[model samples]
Target: TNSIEQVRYICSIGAMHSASAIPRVIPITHCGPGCADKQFMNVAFYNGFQGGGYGGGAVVPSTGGAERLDELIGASLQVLDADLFVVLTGCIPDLVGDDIGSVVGPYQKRGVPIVYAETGGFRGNNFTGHELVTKAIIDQFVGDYDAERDGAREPHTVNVWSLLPYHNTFWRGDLTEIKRLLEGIGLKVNILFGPQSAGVAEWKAIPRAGFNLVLSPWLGLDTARHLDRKYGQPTLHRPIIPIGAKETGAFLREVAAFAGLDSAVVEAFITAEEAVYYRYLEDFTDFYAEYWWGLPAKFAVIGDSAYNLALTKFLVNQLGLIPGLQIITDNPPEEVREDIRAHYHAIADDVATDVSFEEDSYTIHQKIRATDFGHKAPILFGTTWERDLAKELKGAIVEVGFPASYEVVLSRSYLGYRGALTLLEKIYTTTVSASA
Candidate 1:
C-alpha cells in the first residue's frame, strides 16, 4: 500500500551530522522528492535552537527520483561548493538499486573528494544510519593510520558518537556537554559529527585515536564495530550516556578504568568537579519545594533508550523522582533491549522500576494512561506528542527528544551535572507557568 503511519520520522537526520563535518562538508543529498525537506525542515528548520541554515534542501541538489545520479554528481562539480561532496541516498533510491558508485566515480577521477552512503530507512534506526554515513566517511576519506615509533597510537585521542542527529532537540548542547566532560578527564577527544568537530581532518585521524567512545544506550556500537574490523580501531562502549553526577561520575570512572587513569586521580577530579556541580545543584532544593514539594513523585519517560536511561537515573538518583512507565521508542533490536533494562537497574540505585519498549504514539500514550500513577502531578519527559497525554494525565511535561521549539534554546543542555539543572529549569518552568 505504501501507506504511511505517524511513526517518528528520522531518515534524513542520520545524514545531517555525517554531512555537516569533515572539513565542514557541504552535503549534496541524493534522494526521492521531499526527503531532504523531510529532514532539513522537520528536524532542522524547526528544531528550536538548531535552526535550519543555508544550503539545506534549498541550494543543495538531489537526484529527486528522475535524474541519473552520476549525471547529477558530474554536473554538481561545476555548480556545488567545494571542500567535500557526499552522495547520500535514501530508501526509495536504494530500493530501486541506484548505481551510486558509477554516478560519483568520474568526479573522484577528476581529483574531487566524494563520499557515498545508503541511508535507506530500513537499514536501521537513525543511529544506525549515523554509523552508515560515518563508516562511509571512514571508508572513503581516511588515509593514513600512522602510529608512534613504538607502534603506540596517539594517547587521549578517541572518536565520540552520540545517538541520532538534530532529531534530539538538545543534541548540539548535549554533544558539547559530553565533550566538555571528556576533556575534563584530560582526554583529547574528536567528535566526528558536530559543529565542534575537526571535520575532514578528524575523519582522517580516526585510525590514529586510541579508541572509539560510544555514549549511547544501544546506538553507535555498530559504528564502533565497523571501525574496529575495518581499521583496527578499539572501542570503549558506555551503554548509557549519563546526565549528572550519579551517572556521569560513574561513566567517567568507567572511562578512567579503560584509559588506565589512576583511581585516586579520578576520585580527586570527581571531587573537584562535584564542587562546582553541587554548587548549582543546591539551587534545585528551592525547585523541589516550590514546584512539587514531592507532589510530582511518579514520572513517565518516553524517548530513545539513552535518554530513558540517563534521565531515569538523574531523576531518581539525583532529583528523588519516582519512575513510572519507562518507554524506549527507537525499537532497538531484541538482543540489546535487555542491556538497556539492565542499565536501568544499575543506575536506579536499588529503586524498583519497569522499562517498556514501544514506537507507535497511540500505544505509547495508552501506556501512559494505564500507569495508574496516583493523583499526584506526575511529570512526563518526552517529545511534543506527549503534551496531549500529559494534559490528559493532569501532569507536567518538558519535551526532551524532538519538536521542542516553543521556547528559546541558546547554549542550553541536559547532559551533565549542568544538564540536570537545565532540564529542571524547563520542567519547573513549564509547571510554574501552568500553575500561574
Candidate 2:
C-alpha cells in the first residue's frame, strides 16, 4: 500500500562525508560492506564529478559484523595516516542494537582521537545524519569548553554552516566562494569543510566564534542551534543563497551590518565586486538581446528547498524569467515548509510563484507538464532524471543539483558574484546550443 517515490538522497551512513570532508579525517563505517561502497560511488561520481576525499568513497573501511569492526578499526588505525577517525554504524548494527560507543570508547581512553555516531538509515536521511555527525564530533572530539568565559568569544570570527559535503555536488566550489564573500566583508570565516577549511583544527575553534551563520533555508539550522547551546554563540539565519550581483551585494551588506563592520570598507568592497560583475553582464547583454533563436522566458526548478528558493529569486529578480513550477525534493521538516513557501511567495510581487514540496519524480514531472509556459518553451533546472521530461516538453534542462551525471564539475560554482557569472554562461550556453 506504500507508493514509491524516486530516491533523491542517500541514507544516514552517507553522512560519513561529514567526517570525510575534513582534510585528513576518515570514517570507519560499521555496516554492510556494500553500504560504504555504494554511497560513496554514486554520491561522489554520479552527483557532481567530485572525487573521494583523503579517505572517502571506496577508500573507507567497512564491516558487517561487530567482531570484524574491531579488526577493521585496528587495521585502519595502523594503515591510514589521518588526523582523526569517526566510527559510523549503518542499519544492521543499529537494528540489532550494537553499542558503537563501547567499541570506540576503549580507543578513546587510550588518548586516540576517534568519535562515533549511530547513523542508521532508520534515523533519517543524510541531512539528519549530517547533524548527528556534527554533534558527535562537537561532543566527543571537540569536548566541553567554557562557553561562559568572559573572553572566549572572538569579535570577528564566525563559523559557516551551509551545504552538505558530497551530497550538494558543488560543495567544494560553493564553500570557496562563501569563504571569499565573508572575508570580503571584514570577518574571519571558519568554513569547516572542503579545501579552504582548517579541518579538525577549525572545528575545535567553533566555540570561540562570535556567532554562527546558517546560510541556507534549513540545512544547517540544527547544527547552528547545537553550537549555540554548546558554545553560547548567537546565530544569524539567512535563508537565501545569494546568487548574482544583486542578491550577493544585499547579502554582503546584511552580513556587514550584523558583524558591525565599518561601512566605508564594506561599501568599497561591494562597489568593486559589482563593477566586475556588471562588466561581464554588459558584454553578455549583446548576445542576450540579439540571439537569433529563442531563449526560455519561463522556467521550472526541481531541487532541494535552499536551491529551489535561491534560483527562483535570481531567475525572477535578476534574469526576469517567470517561474512556472518550483518543486522541493529534500522533504524538509514540516515546520520550515511554510517559511520556505513565504520566501517563494514574496520573491517579487509580479513574479512570485508558489512552490510544491514533492519527492516523487512522477508527481513532480506531472506538475511541470501541466504548467502554462505561455508561447515560449520552458526551461527545467533539475537533475539527470529530468532529461526525458524536458525532452517531452521540448524544454531546456540545466543539471544544477545532485545526481548530475552529465556535468563534470571541478571547482565551478554558481554562487556569489563570480559564480553568478558562471551560471549566466551555463544558462545561455544551453539555450544557444539548443539551436545547433
Best candidate according to TM-score:
2
- What TM-score, over all chains together, does every model reach? 0.90, 0.96
lDDT of 1 by residue, 295-332 (tens): 57788889888787878878888878778878888778
Q: Pick out the ten consecutive residues of candidate 1 with the lowest summed lDDT.
A: 1-10
In angstroms, the error of model 1 at 154 is 1.0
Pairs in steric clash, model 1: 22-199, 22-200, 23-199, 23-200, 70-103
Report how far residue 96 has shifted in candidate 2, in Å.
0.3
Residue 269, model 2: lDDT of 86
Candidate 2 deviant stretches above 4 angstroms: 33-36, 147-151
Count of clashing pairs, candidate 1: 5
